């Protein structure tokens, strides 16, 4: 408070998290949604607004069309993005952006112009003194405590695995897959139609996402678990809807996350995450693979399915040579780990040299971010 | 362009008669020849180093004539007797001259405890031996060499009188002999001790030659006095020869030398509190939410709901292992369109055709 | 594994074997995951020695 502390903002497709530099915990975590009313409103003299933003939007789900501003990790509606950032700065943190620097995170492989846009609407409108952009998955490795290893980050919008050697990333070995939690929610909604239950609107998609977060797990063996569900009815759970109805999902608990390992269910050509990180390792040099097998770190919201670590280790050990040792690293707070890495990066004294000055931006236009940020 | 050859070569031979300690001794002598060539002390064909395998059976190993020291393998050497006759023909198909072995045989007839005899013809050693005064203790290596003997050499040891004159001049317990105008001979109980003495004498002789040439006379040398100087356990030359065999093995050379103290290579790891622990311990499926059970007629087959109160199975799986199983594989595309035309143009021609009739109506007619 | 030892001069065996071993075995093996274990100042001095 005596000195200006930077703002660490982690912004993915699913939720937005914001906090102060050097803090243990982010101050605000809220879904990245902008809702607009659809029904006729006749109640004059009481509270109506033309648009709802943040957790207030998810509170009044029954009278809105929920609309995600970030699609597959790419910003597609910039006005809603500015509204999200305004609600982040003023409603939640309640600090003006002009006093403090801000730090943003972004996907590894992306359209170029997005970064330019993230520059232009951050200096021109919010009048920040300085900012910086960092790759999301590097911060997971920084927060885990390791300078060398391969990290998979599978958020709600995009999945990507990057190998980092001696704290300094390799661009040619970066693998990006467009398969994340939202596609899993859509697949779960599609396969829940076969039992009779129907979910079609946006609030129903939020309810289905809640069902997925509550009752899903990854089977160690798909065939054995499927035969087990074919034998008895011990794999049945009952979830109570906000209407008051009770549904019994049963067999679908381990079929929804299995699309992560077998993307042929969705019809996509690309194969599962385990062989994806195997190919990412194989694209690197032979000498560094020994450190890469022993330092595999999982991160992101989708990687919080129960039993994901054992299945991942078994598959990647089946793919790996027999003489090599496999170690998976699953932090218990992996869902926030990227933000934690940001808090590490905003506290280093050398990082004061990294900041893009406002004068430098005014001199060089919005293209300063490619040469300044790596 | 890959001049290296495997020193061991016992794998390729598969022949001849060898004792239990013959393999180690042959590998040791060939490694010694390789080291003499690789230091650059000796380069051409001669009989420099000789070994005794058995104390009570003679059978000394010498090098065949006409082979360079780089080309020496273990199987190519020749085992002979004390007199010098070829009791065992070597693997190399070269003419055998056993003339220079005679001096080594005379030294073998002198001492029973000697097993390794090394002769040097390096320029510095020959310059020291040609010098009138003896080797001066002007270096630490010369002090570490120890005592020595000086014998005038006439170049031939065939005569019996020369052999019997060598024996008393050599002494009962002496390790270093100097043949005047011919070089130096080192005697060792083990091969490594003889190699150590050879290396120390070799270094000391260039030290003495350089210091003696630069200083001028003996007065400026201020030489020291030798008298004032005066696992299990190591034996003089074990560690150095072991290190040389280790590095030579790391070149890719196959040496039969086994190690009294083997080497352990561990990277190890430092535990850091910041590091988080590891903490570890085709077909398409169609689901059916229900299960039907066969029930006898109460003949006609009947199937039963089997609801969830009766603990029935939850999910029935159907597996499809290949695409397009619904359609037969072999089919002409023209047939369907032909039949579509056939059906459709009966509307165009507006037939008077009625549906099939059952045969119970046909019987009464 | 065919280390491909360099040819040597008649008086230059030491130099050739030294550069062959330099080609085979690097002198800075601490790079990788092991670089964290040693101190930053100490590792550089170890490399120099």
């Amino acid at each position: 408070d005596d000195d200006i502390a930077a703002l660490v903002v982690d912004n993915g497709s699913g939720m937005c998290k914001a906090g102060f530099a050097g803090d243990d915990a982010p101050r605000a975590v809220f879904p990245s949604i902008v809702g607009r009313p659809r029904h006729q409103g006749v109640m004059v003299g009481m509270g109506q607004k033309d648009s709802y933003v943040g957790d207030e939007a998810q509170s009044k789900r029954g009278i809105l069309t929920l609309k995600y501003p970030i699609e597959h990790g790419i910003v597609t509606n910039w006005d809603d993005m500015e509204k999200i950032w305004h609600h982040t700065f003023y409603n939640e943190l309640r600090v003006a952006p002009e006093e403090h620097p801000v730090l943003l995170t972004e996907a590894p492989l992306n359209p170029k112009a997005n970064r330019e846009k993230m520059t232009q609407i951050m200096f021109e409108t919010f009048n920040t003194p300085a900012m910086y952009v960092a790759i999301q998955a590097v911060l997971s490795l920084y927060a885990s405590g390791r300078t060398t290893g391969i990290v998979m980050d599978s958020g709600d919008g995009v999945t990507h695995t990057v190998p980092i050697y001696e704290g300094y990333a390799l661009p040619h070995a970066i693998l990006r897959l467009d398969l994340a939690g939202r596609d899993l929610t859509d697949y779960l909604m599609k396969i829940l139609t076969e039992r009779g239950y129907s979910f079609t609107t946006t609030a129903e998609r939020e309810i289905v996402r809640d069902i997925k977060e509550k009752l899903c797990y990854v089977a160690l063996d798909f065939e054995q678990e499927m035969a087990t569900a074919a034998s008895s009815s011990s794999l049945e759970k009952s979830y109570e809807l906000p209407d008051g109805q009770v549904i019994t999902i049963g067999n679908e608990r381990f079929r929804c996350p299995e699309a992560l390992f077998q993307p042929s269910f969705l019809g996509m050509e690309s194969c599962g995450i385990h062989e994806t990180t195997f190919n990412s390792i194989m694209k690197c040099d032979v000498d560094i693979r020994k450190d890469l097998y022993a330092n595999t770190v999982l991160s992101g919201g989708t990687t919080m399915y129960p039993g994901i670590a054992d299945r991942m280790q078994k598959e990647i050990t089946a793919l790996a040579p027999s003489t090599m040792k496999i170690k998976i690293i699953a932090p218990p707070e992996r869902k926030y780990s990227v933000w934690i890495g940001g808090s590490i990066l905003a506290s280093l004294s050398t990082f004061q040299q990294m900041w893009i000055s406002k004068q430098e931006y005014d001199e060089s236009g919005p293209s300063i971010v490619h040469r300044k940020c790596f | 362009f890959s001049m290296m050859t495997p020193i061991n070569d016992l794998h390729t031979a598969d022949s001849l008669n060898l004792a239990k300690g013959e393999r180690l001794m042959r590998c040791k002598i060939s490694s010694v020849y390789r080291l003499l060539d690789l230091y650059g002390w000796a380069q051409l064909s001669d009989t420099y180093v000789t070994l005794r395998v058995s104390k009570e059976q003679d059978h000394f190993l010498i090098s065949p004539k006409g082979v360079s020291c780089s080309e020496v393998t273990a199987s190519s050497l020749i085992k002979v007797n004390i007199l010098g006759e070829v009791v065992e023909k070597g693997s190399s198909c070269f003419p055998v001259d056993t003339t220079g072995f005679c001096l080594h045989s005379a030294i073998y007839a002198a001492r029973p405890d000697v097993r390794c005899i090394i002769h040097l013809h390096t320029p510095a050693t020959a310059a020291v031996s040609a010098m009138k005064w003896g080797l001066l203790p002007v270096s630490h290596n010369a002090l570490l060499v120890g005592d020595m003997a000086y014998f005038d050499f006439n170049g031939e040891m065939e005569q019996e009188a020369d052999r019997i004159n060598l024996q008393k001049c050599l002494g009962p317990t002496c390790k270093i002999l100097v043949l005047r105008n011919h070089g130096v001979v080192a005697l060792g109980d083990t091969v490594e001790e003889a190699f150590y003495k050879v290396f120390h004498l070799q270094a000391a002789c260039e030290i003495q030659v350089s210091a003696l040439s630069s200083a001028g006379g003996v007065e400026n040398l201020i030489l020291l006095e030798q008298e004032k100087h005066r696992m299990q356990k190591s034996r003089l030359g074990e560690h150095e020869f072991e290190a040389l065999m280790r590095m030579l093995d790391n070149l890719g050379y196959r040496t039969g030398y086994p190690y009294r103290y083997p080497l352990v290579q561990e990277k190890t790891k430092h535990k850091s509190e910041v590091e988080i622990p590891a903490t570890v311990t085709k077909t398409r499926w169609l689901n059916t939410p229900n299960t039907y059970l066969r029930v006898n007629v109460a003949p006609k087959t009947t199937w039963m709901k089997a609801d969830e109160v009766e603990k029935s199975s939850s999910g029935m799986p159907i597996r499809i292992e290949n695409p397009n199983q619904f359609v037969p594989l072999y089919t002409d595309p023209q047939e369907v369109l032909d039949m579509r035309n056939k059906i459709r143009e009966q509307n165009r021609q507006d037939v008077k055709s009625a549906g099939p009739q059952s045969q119970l109506l046909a019987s009464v007619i | 594994n065919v280390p491909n030892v360099y040819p040597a001069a008649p008086q230059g065996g030491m130099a050739a074997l030294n550069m062959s071993l330099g080609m085979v075995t690097p002198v800075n093996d601490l790079r990788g995951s092991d670089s964290i274990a040693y101190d930053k100042g100490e590792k550089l001095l170890r490399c120099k020695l």
């Binding site: 300094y168 280093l348 004294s349 | 910041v274 | 930053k40």
Partner: peptide, 18 residues
């Protein structure tokens, strides 16, 4: 140790980038 090791590492990204 880890903190000032990342200190140094960020120093060489400054050295290396431009």
């Amino acid at each position: 140790s880890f903190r000032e090791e990342l200190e140094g590492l960020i120093q060489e990204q400054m050295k290396k980038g431009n």
